[PDB]
């Protein structure tokens, strides 16, 4: 029950349905079992049935709002209450990964819907001044006038690109500060995406916890600012991989004498096709019970989610096509809870 795996199967295109791509390769036996079969009429010149277990399987008919409510809504609510959530996303060729993550202007993905829910819930309870920065998952730094002015300019340079969800309940006595970071892991090297268009170093805490040194945490006042930073972040990624987008909420309880608390909602966009192999070993060891999180930079970044300082889950996007069967079988073998070979 540790790392829940959700499978989302993309609907068939009218074009792909005509190219004989529907051969019964991807089948939902039940809400937890995916049945994979080799194509009937092979696209390659030639002449296997596999069963896979997932936490829940959401078929092609499952829309954006329904998918969000059945998976993400509870996790975003958990984060608003004080817990830490990490959502891994998987997909290689035309899987529906980006439609699930960001989506269209109307059919908004899990990331815009989460940001919308956060700001709808925290509405009228936001701490105006970006006074305290959650530089660490457990620590806050105080910013002076010079530092606030400097952080505002970096934010402004990004926003100008250089040169209805029903809310969740939150206690009335708390004030909130929302901060965002966005970085990429390209060939074991870390790159900041919230930098106006150089690598980042992974350092150990004063208590032994790793963190990304000099990574930009941008204070966000509303959903429009958060959305723009994701767009600017993806534009920088497209200018130049594992895409890590983090939302950190600073909770300020009480009047006069304040008690600060930090919660986090992180989304990891895993690259298709070694770091993936270590993550598999790390998730398996986490579900089992030491975890070999140091054997990779990706698992070192998310050390907190393997040491009990947060909860993890995975969303796997699948292409139902017969030409992508071989890619679907690797994705299933990698992400599934259990795997059976039908004899």
Author numbering: 62 to 108, 116 to 231, 286 to 319, 326 to 368, 379 to 411, 431 to 446, 455 to 508
Paper quotes:
KIF20A is a critical kinesin for cell division and a promising anti-cancer drug target. Among these, the Kin-6 KIF20A (MKLP2, Rabkinesin-6) plays critical roles during the metaphase/anaphase transition and cytokinesis. Among the kinesin classes, Kin-6 motor domains are unique in having long N- and C-terminal extensions as well as a particular long sequence inserted within loop L6. We also provide, for the first time, a detailed description of unique sequence differences and their consequences for the structure and function of this atypical kinesin by solving high resolution structures of the nucleotide-free (NF) state of KIF20A, bound and unbound to a microtubule, using cryo-electron microscopy (cryo-EM) and X-ray diffraction, respectively.
